[PDB]
Symmetry: C2
Subunit: 298 residues, 2 copies
């Protein structure tokens, strides 16, 4: 059971942004509303949008921002990469302590999903190696904002811009930089073949050991290079020395060296589960980071 | 790959979470209007928990024995009473963040979100179902201060669950907000264990309909089954029996897809026999049973 962060601090920041007939979700922090810049495009604009030119043709009156039933008056607009910044005449009184951060594939965060024009659900996820996010099967989302919470500080890391044909979404950080080889233009785009986040699977095996689920431990230890040869065969991400270092705390806590756990994982890949489960699951979980496990399993 | 279930946004409940301390025992309470609800075993020592006599423990308490903290603000308790297994502390301030709310008792198979507290504050939210054996599958639950379960329908929070105990297998058990336990469990540290759990068959069938609606059909077959034959097979896999009520409930999805309910039962029978052979349904390599017909009809009948 993966948990998301409590979403209340972000809920107070979700607003609806309308340009023409397009309405989508924006993030209201102090006196700025952040949203995908493609809100300014028409159907025909998307085929080859000149966003800088389209934006200068736009005026403050072209934007309608609503926080609940209160309209926010737009008093200026600028673009930062693929994110539109709408200066509004009112600072959000619910603005939490926050910062904008960029995460790496394999790292986890919570998504507050908007449906029918307001925040509707929250889930925990990992950014896939192919930079997409496995969201809800429900289509027609008005957008999504991804975040982590550390103490009282919300670290915003993701904003959804598009749905991909496979049921996943793709997006930017809050400075408008895309994650992955995607563009906010109407053009043929597909997620690349995805792979399993190996360092997270190892983190989760450590969680299993901490919770007393040990049947999969074996006496063997492999090498980083021998393991990666097997990992590649099974569409697992290569393990790096950095990953090994990251797992260090869990190795010290459990007494299972990383390359020792890698040999357990190699065997699980090559031979299967043999009718057993781990932490009650018949499948290996790759949406817990090492930091998630350390934090939740002491 | 599992099915991506969403929890309700937890903000409306976060505004109601408070800390309740009795002696050395601190746990989560729910502050609604001028009442704080929490498990009555907050008044127990570790010794008491084997055979607590709650009436005897409570008659000896005064209002000022209860420490209630809402953030860095201390709430003054001005009365207290016990309703079944829940303690109700009247405080001198109505919670200004109280949402529209009601208390409801749910049935096994129903879903709800859980706002989990850890280390003395809300720390995580997840979506779950009340299992057929009346337990909740939680997270790692290392040092939980409690949990509150809820649904949110049109800005009204329906509170349906409060966690009281962790059971040996890592699941938890608890009560409705009137303090009545779900299942045969008691708020006493004595040998009690969850019965064998079973899969929520009607939920799996609703989710298969959601899959067809969203364009997944590889698992359909040309067979049907009688209701009794299906139940004889399903129970061999530890699936819950399907009732005529369940058949009625799936009616709208059958009418939407053109697939008779007992035809979908034949498909489920075949999926249990074959597995998924490396394929997914709605992105999931597992059969999902924590998505109810109500939510499917709502999110897919459109
Ligand atoms: Na080993």
């Amino acid at each position: 059971r993966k948990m998301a962060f409590p979403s209340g601090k972000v809920e107070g920041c979700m607003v609806q942004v309308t340009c023409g007939t397009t309405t989508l979700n924006g993030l209201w922090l102090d006196d700025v509303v952040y949203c995908p810049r493609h809100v300014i495009c028409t159907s025909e604009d998307m085929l080859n949008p000149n966003y800088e030119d389209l934006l200068i043709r736009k005026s403050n009156h072209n934007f309608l921002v609503q926080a609940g039933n209160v309209q926010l008056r737009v008093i200026g607009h600028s673009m930062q990469n693929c994110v539109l910044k709408l200066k509004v005449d009112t600072a959000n009184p619910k603005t939490p302590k926050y910062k904008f951060v960029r995460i790496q594939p394999g790292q986890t965060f919570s998504v507050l999903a908007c449906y029918n024009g307001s925040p509707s659900g929250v889930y925990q996820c990992a950014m896939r190696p192919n930079f997409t996010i496995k969201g809800s099967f429900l289509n027609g989302s008005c957008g999504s904002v991804g975040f982590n919470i550390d103490y009282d500080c919300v670290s915003f890391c993701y904003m959804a811009h598009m749905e991909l044909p496979t049921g996943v979404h793709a997006g930017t950080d809050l400075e408008g930089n895309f994650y992955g080889p995607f563009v906010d233009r109407q053009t043929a785009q597909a997620a690349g073949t995805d792979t399993t986040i190996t360092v997270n699977v190892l983190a989760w095996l450590y969680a299993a050991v901490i919770n007393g689920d040990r049947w999969f431990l074996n006496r063997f230890t492999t090498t980083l290079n021998d393991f990666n040869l097997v990992a590649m065969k099974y569409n697992y991400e290569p393990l790096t020395q950095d990953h090994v270092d990251i797992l260090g705390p869990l190795s010290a806590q459990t007494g299972i060296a990383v390359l020792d756990m890698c040999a357990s994982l190699k065997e699980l890949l090559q031979n299967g589960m043999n009718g057993r489960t781990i932490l009650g699951s018949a499948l290996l979980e790759d949406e817990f980071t090492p930091f998630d496990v350390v934090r939740q399993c002491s």
